[PDB]
Structure formats: C-alpha cells, structure tokens
Enzyme design. Structure first.
Site, PDB file in Angstrom:
ATOM      1  N   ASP A  54     -18.121  -9.330  13.579  1.00 44.75           N
ATOM      2  CA  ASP A  54     -17.504 -10.578  13.158  1.00 44.75           C
ATOM      3  C   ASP A  54     -18.550 -11.410  12.423  1.00 44.75           C
ATOM      4  O   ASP A  54     -19.413 -12.038  13.035  1.00 44.75           O
ATOM      5  CB  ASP A  54     -16.935 -11.321  14.372  1.00 44.75           C
ATOM      6  N   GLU A  78     -17.576 -11.286  21.625  1.00 46.02           N
ATOM      7  CA  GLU A  78     -17.075 -12.240  22.627  1.00 46.02           C
ATOM      8  C   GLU A  78     -16.652 -11.584  23.937  1.00 46.02           C
ATOM      9  O   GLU A  78     -15.677 -11.993  24.579  1.00 46.02           O
ATOM     10  CB  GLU A  78     -15.967 -13.131  22.070  1.00 46.02           C
ATOM     11  N   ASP A 138     -12.207 -12.221  21.887  1.00 48.25           N
ATOM     12  CA  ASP A 138     -11.979 -13.587  22.363  1.00 48.25           C
ATOM     13  C   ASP A 138     -12.017 -13.713  23.896  1.00 48.25           C
ATOM     14  O   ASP A 138     -11.101 -14.259  24.522  1.00 48.25           O
ATOM     15  CB  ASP A 138     -10.646 -14.123  21.822  1.00 48.25           C
TER      16      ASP A 138
HETATM   17 MG   LIG Z   1     -13.746 -16.708  18.620  1.00 48.85          MG
END
Ligand SMILES: [Mg+2]
Ligand SMILES: [Mg+2]
EC number: 3.1.4.-
Lengths: 256, 249
Positions: free
Chosen positions: B151, B41, B11
């Site tokens: 992911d 990310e 993130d």
């Molecule tokens: Mg995310």
C-alpha cells in the site's frame, strides 16, 4: 508637519486591524487612531475594517478620506490625508474564487506632484487556502504591471504569504520589489504577526510570519524606500493590542 | 514456471466486524491459494489468527506491536531464506520496509512490502519512503528477481516528483496496459467501509518489479475482496490485488 523638505516623500501605514474581533474594538480603534496621529501618514491601508470601525475612524481620524473595498461584512480601506492627497478614482477588481469576500482595492491619486496607484488587499487566509492565495497574488501583480508607465504603483496589504508561495509564482516580476527586501531584510520589522509577542488571538503557541507586505513598481530608480518600522506594539488599557497584527510604517522617496 | 500473489491492506485498525472481516479475507485467500500474500495493517490478534488459519504459510511480520505488515509464504512452494526490516527514520506512523529472500525452485526472489505514510498532508515523507524502497530494489544481485507489492498511498504526481520509476523498475499495472477494471484499489463509491459520503478513488496499492529482461512477465492482475460479507461491509476499505506472473528463462 509636512514641510518643503519632506515634500518628495510618501509615508504610509498598512495594518490589518482585526475588526472581526469585536472584543474591545472601540478602544482598539482608538489605539490605531493614536498611532495615525503620532506619525500623520499620507496614506493608510487597512484590512478587516467593518462598518462600525469606519465610524470610529471618522471620529478619531477625521483628517482622512476613507475609500472602502465593500459596504458590508469586513473589507479593506484606503485612507487619504485631506489637503495632501488628491483623489482621482477608485477601482475594485474581483477575486472570482474567493471564499472570504476578498478583493483588490485600488485608488488613483496625486500626491507631492506625482501620480500614484495605491492598492491593497487581504489575500485568502490560512495555509489550506494556499492555491487561491497564489491565484490572488497573480491578480495583484498583473494589475501592478498593467498600470500606465508614468504612474507610481504601491501595493500594501495583508498577503498571508509564506515564502515558498511567492516562489511558486516564480517570484516578484522584474520591475516589482518588496520594500522589506529592498531595505536588506532588516530583522526588527520582519515579522508582522507573532503569537509569542501578541496575545490577542489567545493562541497558546509561538508562531510568527511576515504576512503584511509592501510591493512597489516604478521606473528605474524613481521610487526608493527610506525606512520600514513596526507600529502597534503597545498594549492598551484593556491589556490587549490594537490588533493581532503589527502595522508597518513606511516612507519612500520619489526621485527624478 | 510461475509466481502468484495477493497484496492487501486488510484494515486491522478498524475494530468493527474485525473477526468476521478477517475470516472474509481468508475465505478469499482460500479461493486463489496464492504462493505469497503481502498484507498491511495487521494487528497482533489478527496475526495470531493467521498463524492458525494460514498455518500452511510461513508468516513473517514487520513488527510485534501496533499495526504492521506481513508476508506469508506458501510452505512447499516457497523456501524462506531470510528476512530484513529497514526502518523509515522519519515515519510518524511506525511504517517500515519488510523484505524476504526466498526461492521458488531454482529462482531466487527478494519480496518486499510496505505501508507508505498515509494522507495527502504527509506527501513529502511518503516520497522519501518511496525513494528508500526504490533504492533497496536496486541492491539485489542481477540474477535475483525483486518484487515490491504494498500500500503505497501514492498519487501519480508524487511518483513524478520522485523522478519517475527508474528504467529497470516496472509497475505491473502499467506493464499490463493500464487495465481499467483493476485500476482503483481504494474507491469510496464502491466501498462503504469508511462511510465516506462522497466518491473518491485511488490506485494506492501498487506492484513494482525488477527482473533481468524477460525473466519476469506479468500475466494477470485482478481485484479481490469485492464481495460484501454477512455484516453488510467488505473485508477492508481497500480491494486486494491478485497478480500472476511467469518466470521465463
Ligand atoms: Mg487504512
Ligand atoms: Mg485576521
């Protein structure tokens, strides 16, 4: 006028008249009534009627008996030409999971020496409510199938359908037809909601849909669509249309 | 006779407490000292940080701007042989497929990661990307062991729409008997980073592998990154997955 030669026919208009738009509503109602006067349909199926709109209809469309889908808020209505259509009963079927007070309004009538079950609804709106709209379509189609075999069933209303959704149901059942499909998918009346051609919602983009649809179920060959055309494409004095939707004018023949 | 790794969407797009959260990710990586780390990310200053903090790993990235994936390879354990990036032509989120060919001793691997298109509304594109990933997994020579970890943003029904995993591709979580303790990798009841005031949980982060029969055997799978940091938030809105496997000849 409706003479002997025209007696085997039923004509109707179906139209979402956008009573939720309060702006210019009385003039817009007068515009709808002008259309009804021009064509003198036997039946009118309306969606998004509100209580003051009923009063506009009593004033400028007084030759129609009005049957409504609810008393308050916004609702559908079926209008029956006095002297032509004999009213037998009204039925309302709930949509238990609607979030928009939608339902299925049915009126049983006699017209032209034939028994009819006339049905309308305004199915759940917007792409996001697809699942509930599909559930409602199933309710409508089930009710069409359940009618006594002798009666002629016509549904006309604002289905909010996208083509992919009818298929998700597996399609119209075997003895149920879409009038526009029956007539060979004519282009002139394909789209009934078109933000390029209609500015009432003030949407700054061009999208068009066949939201308004007509389904019928009759014994083989007994009900034959003759024509389908749009109405309500004339701007009124205020520079807006009667509604964000176009109406559909349909004639069908009831055959031995 | 093993390979160990962590996959983790960290993130980097959340700028709040990012420096503390990146240090939290690395404190976590330091506890397990994995052979490989697959990240999603990553952003450029996060990558800059890793190049210093993780200088003991070879760092391969999926892009130079915006946000992107990375694969970190432990120097002295993993020999880096090549990298390949495959585009997803219809992504609206700059997603792609990052692959590296490596060796751990005699054993050759193709290691792959991606951050598949996000959100329920982009299901169709996510499915197209999953098909691209699965196609690529089939390309390697039979003697090469293929591991995808990343992911996926997948819902189970999307994998069914895809046709299911092919007979020679396995999900490590499924292989280990679908253990409940590491099932969900994104869980808004247990993770407050997004401040979502409702309880939703998904197995978005997944591990797929292709190996000759019995040559890659998952041994363990655990969630990581579950410790709240000084700032009262987690390293990421996702938990990481720590996986250990044996390569058995
Ligand atoms: Mg995310
Ligand atoms: Mg409307």
């Amino acid at each position: 006028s409706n003479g002997l030669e025209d007696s085997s026919t039923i004509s109707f208009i179906t139209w979402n008249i956008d009573g939720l738009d309060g702006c210019n509503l009385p003039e817009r109602a007068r515009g709808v009534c002008s259309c009804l006067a021009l064509y003198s349909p036997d039946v009118v199926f309306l969606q998004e009627v509100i209580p003051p709109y009923c009063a506009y209809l009593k004033k400028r469309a007084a030759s129609y008996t009005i049957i409504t889908g609810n008393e308050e808020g916004y609702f559908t209505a079926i209008l029956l030409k006095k002297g032509r259509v004999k009213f037998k009963s009204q039925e309302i079927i709930p949509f238990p999971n609607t979030k928009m007070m939608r339902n299925l309004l049915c009126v049983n009538v006699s017209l032209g020496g034939n028994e009819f079950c006339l049905m309308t609804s305004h199915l759940e709106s917007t792409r996001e409510h697809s699942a509930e709209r599909i559930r409602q379509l199933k309710t409508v189609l089930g009710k069409m199938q359940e009618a006594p075999d002798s009666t002629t069933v016509i549904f006309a209303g604002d289905t909010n359908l996208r083509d992919q959704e009818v298929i998700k149901c597996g399609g119209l059942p075997d003895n149920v037809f879409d009038a526009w499909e029956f007539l060979g998918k004519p282009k002139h009346c394909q789209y009934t909601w078109d933000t390029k051609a209609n500015n009432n919602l003030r949407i700054p983009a061009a999208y068009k849909h066949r939201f308004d649809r007509i389904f019928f179920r009759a014994e083989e060959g007994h009900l034959i669509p003759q024509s389908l055309d749009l109405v309500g494409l004339e701007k009124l004095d205020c520079g807006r249309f009667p509604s964000d939707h176009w109406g559909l004018l349909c004639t069908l023949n009831v055959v031995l």
